[PDB]
Amino acid sequence: MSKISVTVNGRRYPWPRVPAIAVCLDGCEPAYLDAAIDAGLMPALKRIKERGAVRLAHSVIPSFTNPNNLSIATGSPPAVHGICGNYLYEPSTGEEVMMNDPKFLRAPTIFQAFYDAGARVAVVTAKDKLRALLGKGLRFDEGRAVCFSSEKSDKATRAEHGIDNASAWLGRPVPEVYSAALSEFVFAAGVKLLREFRPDIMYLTTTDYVQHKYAPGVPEANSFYEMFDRYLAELDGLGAAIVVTADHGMKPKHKADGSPDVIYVQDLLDEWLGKDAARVILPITDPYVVHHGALGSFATAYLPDGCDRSEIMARLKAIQGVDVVLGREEACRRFELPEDRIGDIVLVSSENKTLGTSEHRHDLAALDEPLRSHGGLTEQEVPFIVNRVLPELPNAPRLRNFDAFFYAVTAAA
Ligand SMILES: [Zn+2]
Ligand SMILES: [Zn+2]
């Protein structure tokens, strides 16, 4: 007898005999888990690690939320699926266009591929914009798909989400967006779906709210992972094959005085090339944001026609804190990104620095706690833990976070 599989984006996924789940712990620097385990707060994960398979994996660069979530969802890097940031810039028109709409997704998800093959599929996110992206191609007329967010859980309908009012269904209120509870709702929904819906494939993804605010091992960080462990215990006890990974890590990005350590790339380019001759893009978040949330460790820039790219790169790279500067072609080859959605140059900053645009007009400092962020090579390493015995499982750099479903279904088969 032939084995049953589904082929998606050139990869062969064995049919899972038991439910296959991937959990994306947003911004989960490996140190978060080590600290919570050491504090005695994660007895389930501690045992799961001992008896299963423990690895580190590499995220996509940029180590941003949407590109990595969509990589996990498709089993492919952004060169394939097309989502490499929250927005890009079009030199013609001079318009900044969002890339968090499903029309911009260029490859099928693992979710759609399994759904089309007759599987039961569940996707739960914390944020609703991601929900629409991740849910592309799912259908809700056969009772075989559920896709909703914690954020908009009370708005879910049978026809568009596979469930009527997920808040009422779960019996929990819609959480505050800026909270740990937004993520707890996802885990709780995941458990109830595993019990009652019985998916073949399920994705649970959270937000990095706690992680931007709190360093590994502090009470508020520990409490978050202590909470997660309870849901992990339940999912594991219900018999699912589970991969726990992350979209990216998290590092401090502040000076000794606690203030943001920022390299203002637009100011530099305005000086060398003329004001607004070049355009610096900060794709870690939406383009309208000017409140420290727009500070990450990866940026891209569009340069004036005919200018000496090589010279500009060298000037930028010479700056202490700018670690990597690459042209479009090299950046796309090295980081596996789409050429048509990246600028002329790509910048990656040092471990404890971020990249900004300008000091004139400026970016206001909102929250009080010292800046923590991601986007760079120093937030690429993420946990990758499976609750099954898998001696052949690779390790970083070979193992990627977007191998999560490949190995989850392999374990489940
Ligand atoms: Zn994230
Ligand atoms: Zn973030």
Automatic annotation (TrEMBL):
Positions annotated to bind Zn(2+) 1: 26, 65, 208, 247-248
Keywords assigned: Hydrolase, Metal-binding, Plasmid, Zinc
One GO MF term: nucleoside triphosphate diphosphatase activity
Binding-site residues, Zn(2+) 2: 208, 212, 374
Documented EC number(s): 3.6.1.9
Name of the featured protein: Probable phosphonoacetate hydrolase
Species for this entry: Rhizobium meliloti (strain 1021)
